[PDB]
């Protein structure tokens, strides 16, 4: 119920626009690869369960992990380290008990030193430029649960399901803005769960319809059908669990009509 | 930080201490925050990479502009515009004085300005207070130190419950709610536009209960009527005495009837009744608003 709820939403709407990582940075980086951004990601999800931080940490850590690797070329090696800092960044801008540094420097398994993290947070901040505040899929996702009635909360976890798993696979998900991702995915939520769509509020709200959001399901549709098969299973075995109702254990639709 | 030289030492804070600086360039005079790191233990403190990240977002006529952060490994300083004197320094040069109600109608609408932008872009300053708030010659008003500001998501998610002052600190807060959004800066601006009135502090309590008695006596103990509820929260007791609500003309003897309704709205228990900044702008107590100096 905001008072700023439209102003906010144009305003994040605008910055989305201008956190956004380079699509293809990848293919601009010598040593590492798609395959060692998963398996960061997904590391970074059991972190994320191990200290019990919000999900939104978790999708901060992946923009400015993004942004970095947008600017810098790293090495498979040192590739952990900028992860570290960034969920070490996220937490400081986000939790109410960030993680203290050591536990950091714990969960690497002393891959790296106090002195090493610290002065990557020094970088990151220097590249990131100290701009924090992005918007993230989870930030749009909440704002389009409150336009569902009467509000059923398997929907909205099979929501975020779906929105993490985004983070995972650069190809295809960084070609999508996060208001798109969480369109879509939200509508994949709705249409496993109830049957229902894209309601013409959110039609109204963000510009986009069903068909605009197309691509975005297709992609979303396929990478749900394959998640048991997938290489990284952090954010299914995350899901299975009593707090998000075990939406990571109800069976995708098979078809779209669309 | 060689073009600084530091001119005297202003201030405090807790993580950080506030200087005036000139360039020894340009011969602009600034403000410089300095925090220490100690670059072995913790890193950057969050309350900076709060306010560093908020700030950078937030540029507006009436908000601190930041020019400047010097990562000097082992001290980190801010520059920022330098203001020439914060709100209660200014309140205590006058509250003999009274300060004259067109600064204060300016004052308040500026802050109503600033803070609306704010809440339009996502941040809670969650520390207003006239320590806080920052005064120059021509007639402007600035808010001031983020470091305890932080960025909320629509609807909210449970922030930190140790928060605000306290002479500031809402109901809502003091009674342990879950939830709090962006009625807590309003309250606090209600608090603010009431001390600048009468020069004496709206709610000066001496600890979290204390506090909670010094509402209730002034605006008259709560309850399912005039705040759907109450009864219900945390800290809630129905042991609290029932004070009656007081007359505004005997709690805000000089402020004209435009003003003691919007103070009043300012002011209302129910954080989802409580006027929005941007509604607040809109109203008659803003009629013909001036901009004034202030002649001290
Ligand atoms: C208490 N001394 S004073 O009123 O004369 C005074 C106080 C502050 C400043 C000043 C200039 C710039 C700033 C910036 C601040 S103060 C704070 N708590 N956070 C800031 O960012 O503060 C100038 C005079």
């Known amino acids: ?68 690797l947008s600017s810098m070329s790293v090495l498979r090696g040192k590739l952990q380290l900028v992860g570290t800092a960034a969920m070490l960044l996220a937490s400081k801008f986000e939790e109410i008990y960030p993680p203290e540094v050591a536990e950091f420097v714990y969960i690497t398994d002393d891959t790296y030193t106090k002195k090493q993290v610290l002065r990557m947070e020094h970088l990151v901040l220097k590249v990131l430029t100290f701009d924090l505040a992005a918007p993230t899929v989870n930030q749009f996702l909440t704002q389009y649960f409150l336009h569902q009635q009467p509000a059923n909360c398997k929907v909205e976890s099979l929501a975020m399901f779906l929105g993490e798993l985004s983070l995972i696979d650069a190809d295809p998900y960084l070609k999508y803005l996060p208001s798109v991702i969480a369109g879509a995915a939200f509508h994949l939520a709705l249409y496993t769960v109830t049957g229902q769509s894209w309601p013409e509020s959110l039609i109204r709200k963000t510009g986009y319809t069903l068909e605009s959001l197309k691509p975005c399901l297709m992609d979303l549709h396929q990478t749900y059908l394959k998640a048991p098969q997938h290489a990284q299973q952090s954010i299914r075995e995350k899901y299975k669990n009593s707090k998000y109702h075990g939406v990571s254990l109800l069976n995708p639709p098979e078809t779209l009509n669309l | ?209 204390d506090q909670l008695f010094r509402i209730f006596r002034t605006l008259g103990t709560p309850d399912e009527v005039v705040w759907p509820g109450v009864t219900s929260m945390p800290d809630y007791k129905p042991s609290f005495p029932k004070w009656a609500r007081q007359d505004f003309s005997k709690v805000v003897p000089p402020l004209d009837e435009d003003g003691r309704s919007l103070l009043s709205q300012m002011l209302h228990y129910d954080p989802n009744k409580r006027i929005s900044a941007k509604a607040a702008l809109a109203h008659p107590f803003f009629q013909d608003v001036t901009k004034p100096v202030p002649h001290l």
């Open chain 1, 1 to 68: 119920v905001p008072d700023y709820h439209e102003d906010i939403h144009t305003y994040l709407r605008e910055m989305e626009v201008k956190c956004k990582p380079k699509v293809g940075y990848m293919k601009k980086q010598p040593d590492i690869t798609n395959s060692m951004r998963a398996i960061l990601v997904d590391w970074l999800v059991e972190v994320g369960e191990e200290y019990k931080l919000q999900n939104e940490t978790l999708h901060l850590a992946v923009n400015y992990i993004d942004r970095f």
């Open chain 2, 1 to 209: 930080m060689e073009n600084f030289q530091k001119v005297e030492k202003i201030g405090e804070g807790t993580y950080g201490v506030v200087y005036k600086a000139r360039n020894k360039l340009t011969g602009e005079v600034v403000a410089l925050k300095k925090i220490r790191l100690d670059t072995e233990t913790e890193g950057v403190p969050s309350t900076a990479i709060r306010e560093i990240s908020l700030l950078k977002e937030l540029n507006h006529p009436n908000i601190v502009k930041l020019l400047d952060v010097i990562h000097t490994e082992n001290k980190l300083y801010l520059v920022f515009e330098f203001l020439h004197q914060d709100l209660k320094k200014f309140m205590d040069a006058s509250a003999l004085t009274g300060i004259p109600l067109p600064l204060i109608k300016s004052y308040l609408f500026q802050l109503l300005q600033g803070l609306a932008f704010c809440h339009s872009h996502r941040v809670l300053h969650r520390d207003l207070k006239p320590q806080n708030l920052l005064i120059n010659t021509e007639g402007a008003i600035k808010l001031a130190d983020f470091g305890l500001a932080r960025a909320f998501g629509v609807p909210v998610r449970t922030y930190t419950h140790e928060v605000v002052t306290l002479w500031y600190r809402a109901p809502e807060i003091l009674l342990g709610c879950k939830y709090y959004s962006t009625a807590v800066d309003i309250w606090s601006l209600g608090c603010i536009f009431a001390e600048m009135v009468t020069r004496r502090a709206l709610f000066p309590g001496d600890s979290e209960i």
